[PDB]
């Protein structure tokens, strides 16, 4: 065999105090959707220019929305579509859609999804890409049942749009038969790669208190109905963190313990790299919130904020040929 692994560490400073970060690659430029919060709320679209983020625009200014909305960003090859959806309790859901073909100019208008399918489901902000389902591309907005006590099965549900997020009349069925009774699900988000749909989410322990990552793979059986199944990534004395794919093989991140003093990255469960946030000399710092930002079949970033304002960017190249 022929293995090539290459990593480098770059830093990025942000002038804006971000509450929740959201990363996306667009035309091999790195972008962030920063959520800011005695002052006013903002939803800044930023771009890594050299070693700094640069605020490009504030989408929140352009909408008459209140408080914190859910954010669903979709990056097609040449177009970016961002949706700011109000957070709860009406029959239909109001959202504000933004479109751009470049990183710079976004045009907006308010849309409404009447009698939307995700009533009383829990949603959470995420970045995604179109999912091809039998010669049609769809954008997905997915939700989860908070908790359950009667099992009949319905637990995960997606409303989808094949008209660039204008209308959300499509319903994608997710049969996840391993859904547990008596536990609460937390930050569901679909991981999409080459027409294959998967989900990454958390489950809230009852014997303990910590949230636990779960990752399920779905196979497409009938048109618009997927059947999912849990994927075992368990590793003794390490906590599962983020999941991505490179080379049609999984790349998985782990923390040493629930404090994330260290992070290990495994390539196809065969090779690993250690990330110790002791670089820069910043002693009290970890890799909590470390996520993958895929950029190619061979390249991906692993980003986390070691401290307030500091962004640690690990550029990764992997090739198993």
């Amino acid at each position, epitope marked *: 065999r022929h293995v090539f692994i290459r990593t480098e560490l770059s830093f990025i400073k942000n002038n804006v105090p971000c509450i929740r970060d959201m990363f996306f690659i667009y035309k091999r430029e790195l972008y962030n959707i920063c959520l800011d919060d005695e002052d006013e709320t903002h939803i800044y679209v930023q771009k890594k220019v050299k070693d700094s983020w640069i605020t490009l625009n504030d989408l929140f200014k352009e909408t008459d929305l209140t408080g914190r909305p859910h954010i669903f960003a979709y990056v097609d090859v040449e177009e970016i579509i961002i949706l700011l959806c109000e957070d709860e309790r009406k029959k239909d859901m109001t959202c504000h859609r933004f479109y751009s*073909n470049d990183g710079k100019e976004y045009n907006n208008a308010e849309i409404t999804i009447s009698d939307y399918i995700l009533k009383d489901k829990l949603l959470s902000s995420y970045v995604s890409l179109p999912l091809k389902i039998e010669n049609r591309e769809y954008f997905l907005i997915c939700g989860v049942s908070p908790y359950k006590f009667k099992d009949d099965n319905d637990d995960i549900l997606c409303m989808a*749009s094949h*008209d660039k997020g*204008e*209308t959300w*009349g499509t319903k994608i069925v997710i049969k996840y038969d391993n859904y547990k009774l008596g536990v609460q699900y937390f930050f569901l988000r679909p991981y999409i790669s080459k027409n294959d749909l998967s989900f990454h989410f958390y489950v809230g322990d009852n014997i303990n208190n910590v949230k636990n990552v779960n990752f399920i793979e779905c196979t497409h059986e009938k048109d618009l109905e997927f059947v999912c199944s849990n994927r075992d990534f368990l590793k003794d004395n390490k906590v599962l963190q983020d999941v991505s794919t490179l080379n049609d093989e999984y790349i998985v991140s782990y923390g040493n313990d629930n404090n994330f003093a260290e992070c290990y990255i495994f390539f196809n469960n065969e090779n690993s790299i250690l990330i110790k946030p002791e670089k820069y000399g910043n002693t009290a710092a970890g890799c909590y919130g470390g996520t993958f930002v895929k950029i190619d079949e061979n390249r991906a970033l692993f980003i986390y904020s070691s401290s307030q304002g500091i962004y640690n960017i690990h550029t990764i190249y992997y090739a198993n040929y």
Partner: antibody, heavy 126, light 104 residues
Framework: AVTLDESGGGLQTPGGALSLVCKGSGFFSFSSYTMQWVRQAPGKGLEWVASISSGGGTNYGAAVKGRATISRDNGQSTLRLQLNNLRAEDTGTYYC???????????????????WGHGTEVIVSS | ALTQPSSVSANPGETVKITCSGGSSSYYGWYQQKSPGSAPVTLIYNNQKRPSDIPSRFSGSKSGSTGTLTITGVQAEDEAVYFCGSRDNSGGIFGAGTTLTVLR
């Protein structure tokens, strides 16, 4: 390449209703194109009338909201416009229009249209 | 509100530009109408895309809230009304039309 063939025009009585039809031909996945109606009053410029997205999203120009209904039948590659309570401002030529395969920012945008019909003359007159 | 000049003149061979300013859109389109009867013909759509059987002398551009149609090497048959199309918060908008006058 597609063909857009409009019918349903002619002399109409004021207050009456208009029913235009557009029979598309040579489409490949007609269901996935935003279809539109554009009109042009005699000696005036072009004016957007209505749009229907691939997912059924309809939008209407200010001069026709509340009087117009745009619909499509994907199985037959047809687009229809129904316009009731006709008035003199509704006189003009109505064109069937289609956006490119990639579509654009908004279904109601008029800067992505890559195909037009031959048009049908509508004359609201007593 | 799309604003375009009412008229533009050029000698055959010259390169002429028609600008259309306005609208809150990502894309501009250029439609040519030869006679007031004639159905429009898309010359450029989605800023720069050119439909088949449109000569390569027709070019499309976009710079901010502005769209530009460029005719490189004007011909006598390029005489026509050029309409620009775009999007606004009020729906689809069109320009008033620019008349190209071939000089002789």
């Amino acid at each position: 390449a597609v063909t857009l063939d409009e019918s349903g025009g002619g002399l109409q009585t004021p207050g009456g209703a208009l029913s235009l039809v557009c029979k598309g031909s040579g489409f490949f996945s007609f269901s996935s194109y935003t279809m539109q109606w554009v009109r042009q009053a005699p000696g005036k410029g072009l004016e957007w009338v209505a749009s229907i997205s691939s997912g059924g999203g309809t939008n209407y120009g200010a001069a026709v909201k509340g009087r117009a209904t745009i619909s499509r039948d994907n199985g037959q590659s047809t687009l229809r416009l129904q316009l009731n309570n006709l008035r003199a401002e509704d006189t003009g030529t109505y064109y069937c229009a289609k956006h490119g395969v990639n579509g654009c920012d908004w279904s109601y945008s008029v800067g992505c249209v890559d195909a037009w019909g031959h048009g049908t003359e509508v004359i609201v007159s007593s | 509100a799309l604003t375009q000049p009412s008229s533009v003149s050029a000698n055959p061979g010259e390169t002429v530009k028609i600008t259309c300013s306005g609208g809150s859109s990502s894309y501009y389109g250029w439609y040519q109408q030869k006679s007031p009867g004639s159905a429009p013909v898309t010359l450029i759509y989605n800023n720069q895309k050119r439909p088949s059987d449109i000569p390569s002398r027709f070019s499309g551009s976009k710079s901010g809230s502005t769209g530009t149609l460029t005719i490189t090497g004007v011909q006598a048959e390029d005489e026509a009304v050029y309409f620009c199309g775009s999007r606004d918060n009020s729906g689809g908008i069109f320009g008033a039309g620019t008349t190209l006058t071939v000089l002789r």
